Amino acid sequence: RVSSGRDLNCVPEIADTLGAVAKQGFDFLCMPVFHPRFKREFIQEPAKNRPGPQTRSDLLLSGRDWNTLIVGKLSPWIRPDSKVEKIRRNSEAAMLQELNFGAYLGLPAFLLPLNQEDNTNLARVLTNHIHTGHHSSMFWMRVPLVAPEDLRDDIIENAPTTHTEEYSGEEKTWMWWHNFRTLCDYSKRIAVALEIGADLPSNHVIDRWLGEPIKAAILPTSIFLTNKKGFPVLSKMHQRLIFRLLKLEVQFIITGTNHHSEKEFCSYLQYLEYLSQNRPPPNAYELSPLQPLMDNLESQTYEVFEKDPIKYSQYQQAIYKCLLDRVPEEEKDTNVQVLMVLGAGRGPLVNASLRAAKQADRRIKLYAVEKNPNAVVTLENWQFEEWGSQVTVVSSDMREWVAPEKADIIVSELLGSFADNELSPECLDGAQHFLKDDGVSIPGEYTSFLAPISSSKLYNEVRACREKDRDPEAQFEMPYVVRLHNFHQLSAPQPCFTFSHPNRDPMIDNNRYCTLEFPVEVNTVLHGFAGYFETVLYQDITLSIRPETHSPGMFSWFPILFPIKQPITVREGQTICVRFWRCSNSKKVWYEWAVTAPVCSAIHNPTGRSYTIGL
Amino acid sequence: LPPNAPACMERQLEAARYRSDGALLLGASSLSGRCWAGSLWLFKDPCAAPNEGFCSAGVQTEAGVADLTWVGERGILVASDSGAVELWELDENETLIVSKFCKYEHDDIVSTVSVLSSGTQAVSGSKDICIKVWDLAQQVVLSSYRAHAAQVTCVAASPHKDSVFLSCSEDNRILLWDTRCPKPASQIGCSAPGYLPTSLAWHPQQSEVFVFGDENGTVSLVDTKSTSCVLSSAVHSQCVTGLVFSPHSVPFLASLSEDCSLAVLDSSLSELFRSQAHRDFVRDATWSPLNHSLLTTVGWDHQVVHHVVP
Numbered sequence: 038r039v040s041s042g043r044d045l046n047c048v049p050e051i052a053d054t055l056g057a058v059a060k061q062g063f064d065f066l067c068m069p070v071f072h073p074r075f076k077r078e079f080i081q082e083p084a085k086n087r088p089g090p091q092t093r094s095d096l097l098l099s100g101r102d103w104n105t106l107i108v109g110k111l112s113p114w115i116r117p118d119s120k121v122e123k124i125r126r127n128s129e130a131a132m133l134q135e136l137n138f139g140a141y142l143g144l145p146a147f148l149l150p151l152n153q154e155d156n157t158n159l160a161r162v163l164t165n166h167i168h169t170g171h172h173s174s175m176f177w178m179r180v181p182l183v184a185p186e187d188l189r190d191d192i193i194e195n196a197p198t199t200h201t202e203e204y205s206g207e208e209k210t211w212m213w214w215h216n217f218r219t220l221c222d223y224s225k226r227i228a229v230a231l232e233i234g235a236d237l238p239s240n241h242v243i244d245r246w247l248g249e250p251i252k253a254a255i256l257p258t259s260i261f262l263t264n265k266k267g268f269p270v271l272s273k274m275h276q277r278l279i280f281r282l283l284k285l286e287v288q289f290i291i292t293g294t295n296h297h298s299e300k301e302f303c304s305y306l307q308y309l310e311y312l313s314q315n316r317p318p319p320n321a322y323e324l325s326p327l328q329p330l331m332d333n334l335e336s337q338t339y340e341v342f343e344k345d346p347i348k349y350s351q352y353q354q355a356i357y358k359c360l361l362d363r364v365p366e367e368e369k370d371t372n373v374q375v376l377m378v379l380g381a382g383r384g385p386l387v388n389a390s391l392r393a394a395k396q397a398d399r400r401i402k403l404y405a406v407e408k409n410p411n412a413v414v415t416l417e418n419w420q421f422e423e424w425g426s427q428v429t430v431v432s433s434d435m436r437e438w439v440a441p442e443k444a445d446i447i448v449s450e451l452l453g454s455f456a457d458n459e460l461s462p463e464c465l466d467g468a469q470h471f472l473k474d475d476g477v478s479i480p481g482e483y484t485s486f487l488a489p490i491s492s493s494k495l496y497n498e499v500r501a502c503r504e505k506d507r508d509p510e511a512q513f514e515m516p517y518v519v520r521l522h523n524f525h526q527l528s529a530p531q532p533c534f535t536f537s538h539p540n541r542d543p544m545i546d547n548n549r550y551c552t553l554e555f556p557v558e559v560n561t562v563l564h565g566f567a568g569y570f571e572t573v574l575y576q577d578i579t580l581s582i583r584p585e586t587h588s589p590g591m592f593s594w595f596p597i598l599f600p601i602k603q604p605i606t607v608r609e610g611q612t613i614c615v616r617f618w619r620c621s622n623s624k625k626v627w628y629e630w631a632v633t634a635p636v637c638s639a640i641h642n643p644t645g646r647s648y649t650i651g652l
Numbered sequence: 653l654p655p656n657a658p659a660c661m662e663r664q665l666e667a668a669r670y671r672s673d674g675a676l677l678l679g680a681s682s683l684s685g686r687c688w689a690g691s692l693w694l695f696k697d698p699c700a701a702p703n704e705g706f707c708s709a710g711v712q713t714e715a716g717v718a719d720l721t722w723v724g725e726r727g728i729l730v731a732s733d734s735g736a737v738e739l740w741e742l743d744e745n746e747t748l749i750v751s752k753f754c755k756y757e758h759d760d761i762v763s764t765v766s767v768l769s770s771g772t773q774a775v776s777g778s779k780d781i782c783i784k785v786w787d788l789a790q791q792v793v794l795s796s797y798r799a800h801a802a803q804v805t806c807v808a809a810s811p812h813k814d815s816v817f818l819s820c821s822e823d824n825r826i827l828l829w830d831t832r833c834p835k836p837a838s839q840i841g842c843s844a845p846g847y848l849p850t851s852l853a854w855h856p857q858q859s860e861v862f863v864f865g866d867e868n869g870t871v872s873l874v875d876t877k878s879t880s881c882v883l884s885s886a887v888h889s890q891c892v893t894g895l896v897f898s899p900h901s902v903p904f905l906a907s908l909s910e911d912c913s914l915a916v917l918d919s920s921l922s923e924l925f926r927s928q929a930h931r932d933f934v935r936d937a938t939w940s941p942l943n944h945s946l947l948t949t950v951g952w953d954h955q956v957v958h959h960v961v962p
């Protein structure tokens with residue numbers, strides 16, 4: 038369903054008005070805490086000594102009603118950035134008065150307007166209110182998609198509207214939000230209440246709001262069209278924006294009087310509910326945003342990583358093809374192919390290898406190697422109750438285990454967000470000694486990819502991960518497991534590093550260094566880099582989490598995020614240059630990264646001070 | 653007290669208008685307390701105001717009143733907070749105030765209204781940035797204009813032209829309108845952008861000149877043909893809320909402000925009279941049709957002061 042509210046700048050009877058909007062079907066109400074025309078004086082006599090009350094009582098609604106049904110509104114006369122010092126000083130005290138009253142009522146959100154370029158003093162008064170007593174209160178900034186100056190009708194004779202293309206000028210409203218958000222030091226309590234106009238701007242303007250903290254979407258009655266029945270509807274372009282906003286789970290707000298007088302306000306809400314009940318169908322991937330790389334791995338953590346039928350059906354086909362290619366029809370019963378499952382886990386690859394041998398109709402001798410003794414319990418119980426003498430469970434590290442015979446095929450996997458998955462090159466290098474001279478490794482190739490991303494929401498989430506007894510900026514020097522739905526990609530992903538198994542080099546060095554140049558054709562703000570990977574199990578049988586070559590049905594593998602301490606402003610035509618290192622000692626493996634264009638950033642995670650994966 | 657009239661008048665007085673025969677019209681709004689609604693009042697005796705028990709006619713409107721204007725001798729045009737323009741007509745014996753139409757067309761609060769010279773058409777300015785031309789007989793909107801970029805502060809119809817009118821907003825624009833043009837709006841005023849315009853007043857003798865007040869307390873005289881500001885005076889210390897011309901052959905300009913003071917200026921904008929009787933914001937002013945030296949002013953302090961202008 039649609040979580041929606043009604044916006045009203047006129048409330049004569051607070052009890053009767055709330056009953057009218059609840060009857061219409063609205064969940065909450067955007068109303069003013071003080072009368073919009075009631076201009077108060079605070080310095081000049083005798084208007085400052087005006088007899089009270091200054092507004093209506095808090096007793097008129099119950100505590101639960103103020104906490105869940107009423108969203109505050111700042112009075113329109115309050116202009117803290119006015120050219121007149123008297124209006125400026127009076128608006129400062131009135132803003133504090135209205136913000137403190139909103140906190141006193143315990144309102145879940147408070148609406149403040151961004152209708153001009155300069156809101157520096159409105160930013161100071163709000164930043165001061167937030168730093169005066171901790172609260173769960175939210176602040177929604179009313180920002181339009183198109184400024185009213187660029188929306189006005191061309192009816193002024195000696196002042197015509199600009200018809201020429203102005204790429205940066207069309208994005209000025211985002212600059213109003215960004216400058217205000219920057220001044221307030223990226224407060225977790227300041228969000229966007231995006232106001233949609235009659236005519237939508239170009240795609241790049243709407244795309245600039247991707248990754249921004251949009252918590253509300255304001256829709257005026259003026260933007261609604263009249264269908265061939267007399268009911269309020271929306272254009273196909275306006276409908277496209279509603280589908281995008283519904284996926285972000287924003288609270289839709291209805292503003293303005295009923296222009297469809299022959300109908301009612303309930304029909305405007307019925308059309309939004311009609312859009313959600315008939316929105317595009319979701320996929321298996323669609324059915325906190327960031328989680329760090331897991332190293333504990335419990336029974337349920339192994340279970341959710343095993344919830345990938347597409348991954349093991351590919352592994353089955355990869356082993357099935359390798360068996361027929363290694364042993365012909367004449368050696369069907371006389372030749373036994375020794376298979377070694379390195380990192381056996383709870384037996385998902387083992388069962389897939391057994392299903393492949395029955396499919397290929399070839400003889401196999403299985404060895405199930407696993408370091409985790411908790412997972413070995415599941416393997417040894419599986420072997421005794423189902424597998425038998427065919428599968429030999431080994432409770433040892435693949436790098437230190439002494440095998441009784443050389444292997445024909447070695448099978449390994451990366452499961453979920455396990456931190457030790459990054460050690461795959463070193464783990465397979467210490468296991469290839471007990472592999473035959475003509476032996477095959479499944480997978481045989483791994484190729485990683487990097488892409489520049491923009492997400493002001495994810496940047497503030499990493500920023501909130503500050504911990505005591507460690508560097509206050511350590512959170513930006515470590516990778517995170519994030520969903521593709523959150524961030525906005527700035528350029529096509531490019532190859533970062535490749536690993537081939539078995540490694541034939543006489544002097545194997547798993548250390549890497551690449552310089553990637555990404556062309557950016559939009560005005561944006563860089564917050565970090567997303568990492569994807571492609572794997573070649575056997576010949577044409579592959580698995581990929583890269584957005585272009587993504588395997589349909591995959592759910593266990595999520596992209597990795599490498600954030601940056603300070604976000605970098607990127608212009609149209611500019612190039613993002615990233616420097617990435619994969620570093621490895623004789624004990625630890627870590628990642629290092631830095632930005633060299635358009636502007637320079639500090640090298641992240643030097644010597645792995647914030648993050649390392651122990652071998 | 654008359655029937656259907658409210659028991660108590662609302663504290664904040666928004667409008668004061670004198671009818672041709674000398675009847676006083678009052679607009680009251682409750683900008684604080686439990687109820688945030690408005691009320692319309694008629695007083696055949698000017699000295700009887702603000703006493704509720706001794707009024708000719710009274711009624712309570714759905715929401716608060718922001719601006720008023722006489723539509724002849726029986727019609728009353730209301731600028732409501734609900735975003736509606738209301739038309740209330742008087743009784744045969746003028747004892748009741750009955751509603752003719754309540755059309756909700758403006759998305760936000762209707763802050764200003766002005767009836768055109770014909771008396772059959774009226775212009776309305778609202779916080780929704782829009783300006784609407786209304787048909788008082790057909791009860792519908794003729795044209796909807798979105799020429800400004802901020803809330804419309806004041807709309808004033810020309811004294812004797814049905815197509816010409818002035819409109820000012822918080823976007824620092826003073827627009828001279830003429831519906832006879834394909835592009836009706838025309839940006840007029842000072843050369844360099846100064847302080848925001850708050851009040852507009854057409855000259856009753858010279859239909860080509862007008863006066864405007866800003867947010868800093870300055871009143872300026874401007875000719876539409878000359879389009880270059882030459883005469884200006886720092887009248888008040890706070891925002892100029894209203895400006896009203898006297899009915900004299902040589903008109904006097906009554907200046908209103910939030911600094912709780914009333915000022916009377918000549919033609920060269922020089923101070924002739926100044927009253928500090930109001931202890932709160934001075935909202936409206938109207939010169940008496942019988943005695944042209946009498947000026948009635950209202951405020952948010954619930955005071956209906958009568959001044960003697962020399």
Ligand SMILES: CN1C(=O)[C@@](CCC2CCCCC2)(c2ccccc2)N=C1N
Pocket residue numbers: 458459460461462483484485486487533536567568569570595596597628
């Ligand atoms: C989701 N994810 C990645 O895309 C990847 C590549 C996996 C990596 C392949 C080679 C062998 C070891 C593992 C990465 C790491 C660094 C840069 C780009 C991508 N690691 C994680 N967790």
